[PDB]
Structure formats: C-alpha cells, structure tokens
Amino acid sequence: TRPNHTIYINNLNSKIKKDELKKSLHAIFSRFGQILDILVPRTRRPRGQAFVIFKEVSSATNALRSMQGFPFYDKPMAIQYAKTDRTI
RNA sequence: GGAGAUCUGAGCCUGGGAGCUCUCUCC
C-alpha cells in the first residue's frame, strides 16, 4: 500500500454512537486539512472502523503519522492508508 | 436499483476479521 487521500482507522470503540464517532473524528482530524468525507460503514459485527477522506494526500500523511496509536474514546487508534482510495 | 437499519435484525465464512449474503425501512 502507498499513500492516498484516504486513511483507514479501526480499533475504534464499538460502544460509541456512530454519529458521535463521526463528529469527534471530524473535530480531531480536521486540524491536518480539509476533510471531504468521513465514513463509518455498517459492519456485520459492531462498528469499529472508519474512513477519513482528506482533500490532499499530505493531510492524510500527517494525519496518519500524528494520530497513530493515539487514545480515542479510551482506545488507541490503528491507522493505515485505505487499500483503495475512496475519493470519487 | 439507490440511500439507510443489528454492542438495539439474521445466516454463513473467518478462528490473529478491511469476508459473502440475507432481512427490514424509505425513495
């Protein structure tokens, strides 16, 4: 995998409501750059993943470096570049 | 077809979870 506009975040707290997770993620990650969209897809098992789609790849690069393993609702976030870029 | 719904709908797969499908609601 190589850098792209989208970061993949998992190990998120499954006990937090979706919309509050999407809101907090936006508030925390927006400092790195403009966010085009935040996705918290409906998993078969309880939600524990999200995609943050930045406008520039550099914003994703810095977002991934800074927030790697950072506590988030009492859990360290595991961050990667999204397998497939989710920008349309 | 599209958009949603399960720690608060379900089966299978996996067995160190970015899997497949169904069901329901709305358009």
Residue numbers in the entry: 6 to 93
The paper states:
To examine the role of arginine placement in TAR recognition, we first considered TBP6.3, which differs from TBP6.7 by the change of Q48T and T50R. ITC analysis showed a KD of 45.2 ± 3.4 nm for TBP6.3, representing a ΔΔG° of +1.2 kcal mol−1 compared with TBP6.7—signifying a less favorable binding equivalent to ∼2 hydrogen bonds (Krel of 8-fold). However, we observed that Arg-50 of TBP6.3 displaced Arg-52, usurping its role in Gua36 recognition. Arg-52 adopted a new conformation that protrudes into the TAR bulge to interact with the backbone at the pro-Rp oxygen of Uri23. Thr-48 had no deleterious effects except that its side chain is too short to hydrogen-bond with the phosphate backbone as observed for Gln-48 in TBP6.7. Although TBP6.3 contains four arginines, this variant exhibited 8.5-fold weaker binding than TBP6.7, which has three β2-β3 loop arginines. Although TBP6.3 contains four arginines like TBP6.9, the former exhibits two suboptimal interactions. Namely, the Arg-50 guanidinium is not co-planar with the Gua36 base, yielding a weak inclined hydrogen bond interaction to the base Hoogsteen edge. Similarly, accommodation of Arg-50 in place of Arg-52 pulls nearby Arg-49 away from the phosphate backbone such that the Arg-49 guanidium group hydrogen-bonds to O6 and N7 of Gua28 rather than N7 and the Gua28 phosphate—as observed in TBP6.9. In contrast, TBP6.3 cannot form this interaction because Thr-50 was replaced by Arg-50.
